[PDB]
Amino acid sequence: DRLDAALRFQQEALNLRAQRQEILAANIANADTPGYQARDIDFASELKKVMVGVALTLTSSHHIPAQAVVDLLYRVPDQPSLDGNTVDMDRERTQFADNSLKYQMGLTVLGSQLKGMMNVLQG
Amino acid sequence: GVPGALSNQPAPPNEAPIATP
Amino acid sequence: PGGVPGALSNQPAPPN
Amino acid sequence: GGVPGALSNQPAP
Amino acid sequence: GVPGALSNQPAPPNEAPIATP
Amino acid sequence: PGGVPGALSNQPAPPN
Amino acid sequence: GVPGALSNQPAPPNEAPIATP
Amino acid sequence: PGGVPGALSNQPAPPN
Amino acid sequence: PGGVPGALSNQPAPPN
Amino acid sequence: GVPGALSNQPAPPNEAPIAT
Amino acid sequence: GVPGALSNQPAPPNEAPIAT
Amino acid sequence: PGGVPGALSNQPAPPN
Amino acid sequence: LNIFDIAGSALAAQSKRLNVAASNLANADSVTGPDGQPYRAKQVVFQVDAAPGQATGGVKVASVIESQAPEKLVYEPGNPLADANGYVKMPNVDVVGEMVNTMSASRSYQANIEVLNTVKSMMLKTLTLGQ
Amino acid sequence: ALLNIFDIAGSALAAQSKRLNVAASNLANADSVTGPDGQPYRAKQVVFQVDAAPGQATGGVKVASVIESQAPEKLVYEPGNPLADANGYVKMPNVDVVGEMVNTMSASRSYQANIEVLNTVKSMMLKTLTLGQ
Amino acid sequence: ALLNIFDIAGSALAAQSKRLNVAASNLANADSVTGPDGQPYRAKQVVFQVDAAPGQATGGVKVASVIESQAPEKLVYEPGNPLADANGYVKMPNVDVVGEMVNTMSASRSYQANIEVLNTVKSMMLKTLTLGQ
Amino acid sequence: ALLNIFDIAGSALAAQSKRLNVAASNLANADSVTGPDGQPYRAKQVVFQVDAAPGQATGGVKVASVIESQAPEKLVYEPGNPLADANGYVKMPNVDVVGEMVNTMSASRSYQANIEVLNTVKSMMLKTLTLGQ
Amino acid sequence: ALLNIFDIAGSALAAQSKRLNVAASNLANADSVTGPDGQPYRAKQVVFQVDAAPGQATGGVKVASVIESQAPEKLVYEPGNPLADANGYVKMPNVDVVGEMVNTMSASRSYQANIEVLNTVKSMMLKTLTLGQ
Amino acid sequence: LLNIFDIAGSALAAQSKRLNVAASNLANADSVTGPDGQPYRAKQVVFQVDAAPGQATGGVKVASVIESQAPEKLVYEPGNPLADANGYVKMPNVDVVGEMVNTMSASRSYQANIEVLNTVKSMMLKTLTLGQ
Amino acid sequence: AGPRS
Amino acid sequence: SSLWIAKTGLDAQQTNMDVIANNLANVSTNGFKRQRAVFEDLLYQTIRQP
């Protein structure tokens, strides 16, 4: 559908921001686990990958339709801890706040696009 | 390289011995 | 497989 | 120009 | 009645004696 | 019907 | 003169003298 | 009319 | 069912 | 099961005896 | 001039010197 | 003619 | 929505660690338990809780263990609890370590609280989308 | 990735954290006689550089490396120690106490100032996004 | 001519963002000692001018250039640090922390005021588009 | 006058403001030795009572009068004081400091509660006007 | 009448207020020697139960009664006290001051939590009122 | 322009002027000299009703800024160049508590006037949709 | 039977 | 800022304390000359000229 193509980029950006938000909050929650590595995703590359499949064929009514079913990069440690935990509070707190801001911005842009498509139709 | 960058490799374990092995 | 948090894992102990 | 804005993406990327 | 409910009669006067008679 | 709303009515006093 | 009401005559000017007279 | 507002007016002063 | 909340039910007591 | 899961059977009563 | 009024002539440059 | 905004132009400048 | 589970698990784990620290502080000078054995200091074990296969997730307290650290020995031969040499086993609680654990657990608790507040606000605002 | 103000203030926070860590490690090892091997502990210093950046006018703070101080190591006459030299002077670290407390206080106040800057900017950040809707 | 308010307030927002960024960069490097070239960090400040081409009555605001702040470099006596002077006078930036914090607050407030201007202007443009209908 | 709940809550606000004023006056003059007439400052107290004259039981709050406390004034021995009596005793206020502090805090809290009541009543009356569009 | 969560949170607020009042009474008279009839002041506690109605172990809290601690009263030695027994021992309250402080703090935080619950439910149902806009 | 708008704007200006005077006084609690060498005499604003064409009710205008007539404080520093023949240097009569309270009350009045202006603007916005 | 269900 | 100014002050008094401790430790040494520490203020900064 052409409607999907217009809203594909913002929807994928919003979903990627939510996933990275979950990853950052997991990093915050597991700050005290000894031996836990701080993981993160490269937002731009994954957004390229998602923006850039074959539903199995259903011959009749009984035939069952096809059933549907990101890469994590390690953060470079800054300070060496003794328990092997590489999670840094300041870095991930700033990243968490930034991701929240960008999620809000994506919501704003997507809502503006939908509202414009709506006022085009209203009459 | 820079602290806070992104790499595809986990950091080596953080060992701190008390005596020289 | 993370271990004990806090005091025990932040004290210098010989490896075993 | 010479100065990037505060609300711009890391000029240092 | 139970506290906070509605009754048909006023509550009795409240008094705190310093020393009982 | 009323009186001093505070310290002077919430302290024990001898009777009259 | 009920407080909070409306009266035709203006309020008299208040005064706070430190000593008696 | 009016005078200095605030601290100076709402402070006891010698009569004059 | 329940009992005293707080102080009297959160201390070690002799069996009875 | 999991410390915060849902079960249908009540947890056994907990008592703290002075001596066993 | 009354403050907040309109005049056709600009206000003079103001200065706050430390020593006269 | 504008100038530097904020702290520099709102602190008492040198005479000359 | 998984972030609520992650942060709630973090809050529960930090509460458990704080309770263990409080128990260690309370019985630093304790002599005996309900039986004749001394008070062995407690420590929680933090693990990464990822019920699905995506590597990471929240933190979970796998177990509460008694530190294998040696038991302090005090010479009290008149005590019936003393062994053949007249020594009594007193706990090995690290006072400074437990106070630092209390404060660090408190700070991590607040960080998770702030995360929960922020994400709750974002999830409330996403329902407004285009309306 | 990060917005420019976010990157600058977060780099400031990380740099202050590194300086505080160096100060704390020095204060811990104030009385250490021998290190991992047998050599005396040397007081560490952290050097702040300004992230050059394409803008140059605007840039955060980075830390190139942690250097080891070059000051006369304290000599204490203990000939019985195995680490005493021919003359018998064991080497104690050059960690000064007053300087490290002052460094801790200064790092804490810079950290808090950058935190306040981020907190101030945030409200404006969230209020920017209401311009379109 | 309500459309020109878009340009005026957008220029004002960009200029205030640049000013806030410069102030934050100065604040985050108050404790720096070295630059990318080895020179001490010099506190920098923007210059505000009326964004009016010759013959234009009143416009928004624009950042002409970024200039080094005029203040004596803070001299510190540390002739043990590898960076030093002939007499051991380490040069530290002349950042006035109170001034930078006040500048950040002022920039944020002016930014928010310009956002309000833009919001109410857009509301008026929509009305106007609903003139006769 | 003030509709209904408006009048009730306004009366409550005025009465609690008067009570807080009395408490502040008592706190300020806890150490006053004399007044303009040479009489000691006696602690003042307001008298709260309902005002439901048109055939009601509930009508709000009004301050009937301000009354001076009859608790015995504090006698301090000072024979050189011009205000001392035949035995050399000077009368000093019977202000209860803790009582007046608690009165201040309680008056502030109930004043705030009445503010919240009036604001809510306004909200509800504002929505009422949109009954059936 | 109060509906659901409003009833639950109101019951919880009332019972927490009762608990705090009992704690304040215990902490205030922790040193009282006699009551009005000559008997000692025995520490009071509240008894919490689950409203339940008849078939719902899912209700608020309700204070069934205020019990009096039957723990033995402290004994002090005062043969001159009229209230002393034949052995010269005066009974004194068995109040645990630390327990009362902790109970006051706990009633406070629980009171605040139930206030927050009530506010959230009120907002939720106010927004429910506009279902379908 | 609009009456209530004129009233609220004039009152905002007056309260801002009072706040600025109080802040300047608080800054100069310990000042010992000015540019000419005279002591800093504390400033206080004079409020007057702005109802020139509006009968007895109107906005508030700041008539003037006047030096307070409270006696100047005196400090015995005979080595100070500003000391007179008796050796007393004149220091300002700024009352700290009064200035702090003035700042707080001016802030509260400023906020109240802003709320009044907002409510009035909303009322006219709703008046703009009469009969529709 | 334990905690069967 | 003032912090380092006062830190330099603290460092000078500690130096003086170390000098005094050295002098007091060498009371019984034969042929010892007492050490006396003198201090100097560093460069004055001019911000605005009179």
Side-chain angles (χ1 to χ4, degrees), chain A residues 76-94:
Chain A
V76 178
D78 195 2
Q79 274 144 19
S81 69
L82 181 67
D83 49 14
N85 173 26
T86 76
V87 175
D88 254 347
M89 263 318 97
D90 323 304
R91 236 59 154 264
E92 70 174 4
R93 282 192 289 239
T94 63

Side-chain angles (χ1 to χ4, degrees), chain M residues 10-94:
Chain M
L11 295 175
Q14 303 283 5
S15 179
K16 300 218 204 350
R17 164 160 106 149
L18 178 71
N19 296 359
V20 163
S23 293
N24 283 343
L25 289 207
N27 317 64
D29 295 339
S30 150
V31 193
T32 181
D35 42 8
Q37 299 287 349
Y39 174 61
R40 324 261 191 200
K42 300 184 205 174
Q43 322 259 345
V44 289
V45 181
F46 277 177
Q47 292 187 359
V48 180
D49 158 88
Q54 51 238 52
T56 71
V59 70
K60 92 187 157 182
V61 180
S63 59
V64 167
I65 68 194
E66 275 73 5
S67 174
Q68 317 87 0
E71 279 291 334
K72 301 226 184 189
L73 302 170
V74 316
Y75 184 68
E76 244 180 49
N79 197 307
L81 268 274
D83 63 325
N85 298 333
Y87 291 103
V88 171
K89 305 178 230 170
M90 300 294 195
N92 35 22
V93 161
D94 184 14

Side-chain angles (χ1 to χ4, degrees), chain O residues 12-30:
Chain O
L13 285 174
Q16 300 281 6
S17 168
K18 293 170 191 173
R19 166 214 210 190
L20 163 71
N21 203 9
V22 166
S25 160
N26 290 345
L27 210 159
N29 286 155

Side-chain angles (χ1 to χ4, degrees), chain L residues 2-14:
Chain L
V4 165
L8 199 64
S9 74
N10 273 6
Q11 263 184 60

Side-chain angles (χ1 to χ4, degrees), chain A residues 25-26 30 32-33 103-104 107, chain M residues 3 14 17 57-59 125-126:
Chain A
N30 276 277
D32 295 329
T33 307
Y103 184 79
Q104 312 263 290
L107 282 174
Chain M
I3 220 174
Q14 303 283 5
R17 164 160 106 149
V59 70
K125 214 172 301 313
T126 191

Side-chain angles (χ1 to χ4, degrees), chain F:
Chain F
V4 177
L8 229 41
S9 56
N10 276 41
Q11 283 168 356
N16 303 58

